[PDB]
Design a protein around this ligand. Structure first.
Ligand SMILES: C/C=C1/CN2[C@H]3C[C@@H]1[C@H](C=O)[C@@H]2Cc1c3[nH]c2ccccc12
Length: 254
């Protein structure tokens, strides 16, 4: 038995893991799927969350409650990788392996905004399609909020998923933030902390929102201890290939 803590990306929520949580449990493991602040059915509203630590606070509540005797495996995807990073900085010893599936993997050597800068470098400005962006917070120093466009979701996140999974996410997706202006002010991670945590990576070769060539770039520039691939996972591998993410994760963790 291991304890997996599962962390969703932006605009999503704990619900994305609904297909993978049973699977890990039927193999005999403990699973936690967290909702981050203003995501899923978390009661907070976006415009009351201005920092990324505030956003990541329900993950941090989980990590503080890992008994002294225990460790967890973390799985994050997309923007979830950033929360994995804070978890890994603050509680390095409570994590046996941090697993990043088609996620940005922070590097103690750069500002926390660096994977975002590199994404703008490597991807076109129209990458998010019908998604839409607006400022919130103080007009004097603003946040950016985003909503996922229906086409963006169908073509570029859930394209190897059932229309059912696509429909559920339209019902459940909420405005998100990538916290860029706050992340630009956050303390960097260190190698003594963040950097002491074994890391794994799971490629999702068919992720059109985060192309594999760019996922491959985080492993080449930061490194990972283990690395797997899902030939047919899209951005939502946990929904499109839930049995393969399970298999990868038991491999990585055993
Ligand atoms: C919530 C929709 C998004 C679209 N896109 C955006 C933001 C999110 C999503 C992950 O949740 C991916 C992957 C990603 C994005 N920006 C990145 C920067 C560095 C590495 C990966 C990314």
């Amino acid at each position: 038995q291991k304890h997996f803590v599962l962390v969703h990306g932006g605009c999503l929520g704990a619900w994305i893991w609904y297909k993978l949580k049973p699977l890990l449990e039927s193999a005999g493991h403990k699973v936690t799927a967290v909702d981050l602040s203003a995501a899923g059915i978390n009661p907070r509203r976006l415009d009351e969350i201005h920092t990324f630590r505030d956003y990541s606070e329900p993950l941090m509540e989980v990590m503080a409650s890992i008994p002294p005797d225990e460790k967890v495996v973390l799985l994050g995807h997309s923007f979830g990788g950033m929360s994995l990073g804070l978890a890994m900085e603050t509680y390095p010893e409570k994590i046996s392996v941090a697993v990043f599936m088609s996620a940005m993997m922070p590097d103690p050597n750069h500002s926390l905004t660096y994977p975002f800068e590199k994404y703008n470098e490597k991807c076109p400005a129209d990458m998010m399609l019908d998604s839409q962006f607006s400022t919130y917070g103080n007009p004097e120093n603003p946040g950016m909020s985003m909503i996922l466009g229906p086409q963006f979701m169908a073509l570029k996140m859930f394209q190897n998923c059932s229309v059912e999974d696509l429909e559920l996410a339209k019902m459940l997706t909420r405005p998100g933030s990538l916290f860029f202006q706050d992340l630009a002010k956050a303390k960097k991670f260190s190698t003594e902390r963040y950097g002491s945590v074994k890391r794994a990576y799971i490629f999702c070769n068919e992720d059109k929102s985060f192309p594999v060539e760019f996922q491959k770039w985080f492993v080449e520039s930061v490194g990972a201890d283990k690395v797997k691939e899902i030939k047919e996972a899209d951005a939502m591998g946990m929904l499109s290939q839930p049995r393969e993410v399970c298999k990868c994760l038991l491999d990585i963790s055993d």
